[PDB]
Amino acid sequence: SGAIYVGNYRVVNRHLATHNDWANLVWEDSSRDLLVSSTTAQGCDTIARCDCQTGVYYCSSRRKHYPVSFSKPSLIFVEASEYYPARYQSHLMLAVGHSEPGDCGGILRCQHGVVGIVSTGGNGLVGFADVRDLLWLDE
C-alpha cells in the first residue's frame, strides 16, 4: 500500500495497480515494477534529482520510518512470485532493513526529496524502485 503523488501523476507498484490506474495509464514497465497513471488533482511530492545513497523509508509492517544506506539503481535478480515470473528487475536499489509483502509502496526519501518506493525485500534486505531518472514527472 503506497503511492507517490507528483503533479498530475500517481506513481505506484505495477503489481498493486488498480483498475483505475490502467484506465488512465500514462506509462508502465514490468521490468521496473512501476506504473504511472493520471490524476485530476495537483500532487505536491518533490522528487529528488540526485545520486544519494542514504535516506529514510516508511515500513507499514512496523509503523516506523527507518534510516538506510542503499545501493546505486541496478539489475537485480528477483525470485519468481505470484505477479511476475523469475526475472532481473532493473533500476532497483538494495538496503539492509526489515520488509514484509504488505510493505510495497512505502516511500524512500533523502534531504532532496522522494527517491523511490519499496518493491522487493527478504532475508534481512529491502529493495526500492528508483524514480529519480523519470524527469518527465516534474514537467
Ligand X SMILES: CSc1cccnc1CC(=O)N1CCC[C@H](C(N)=O)C1
Looking at the chain, the number of H-run helices and the number of E-run strands are 1, 10
Whole-angstrom distance, CA of residue 28 vs CA of residue 47: 18
What are the CA-CA distances from residue 122 to residues 79, 85, 113, 125, 130 (Å)? 10, 17, 25, 5, 18
Whole-angstrom distance, CA of residue 7 vs CA of residue 53: 25
Does residue number 52 form part of the binding site for Zn ion (CB under 5 A)? yes
Q: How far is the CB of 98 from ligand X (least distance, A)?
A: 8
Is 33 an active-site residue?
A: yes
Place of cell 527517491: 115
112 known ligand binder = yes
Q: Which of 95, 97, 103, 137 binds ligand X (CB under 6 A)?
A: 103
Question: Nearest 10 degrees: CA dihedral of 3, 10, 29, 114?
Answer: -60
Residue 119 interacting partner from Zn ion, ligand X, none (CB closer than 5 to 8 Å by kind)? ligand X
Whole-angstrom distance, CA of residue 58 vs CA of residue 74: 21
44 known ligand binder = no
Does residue number 122 form part of the binding site for ligand X (CB under 6 A)? yes
Does residue number 75 form part of the binding site for Zn ion (CB under 5 A)? no
98 known ligand binder = no
Is 15 an active-site residue?
A: yes
Residue 67 interacting partner from ligand X, Zn ion, none (CB closer than 5 to 8 Å by kind)? none
Task: Just list the catalytic residues.
Answer: 15, 33, 104
User: What is the contact surface with ligand X in residues (CB under 6 A)?
Assistant: 15, 33, 78, 81, 83-84, 89, 99-101, 103-104, 118-122
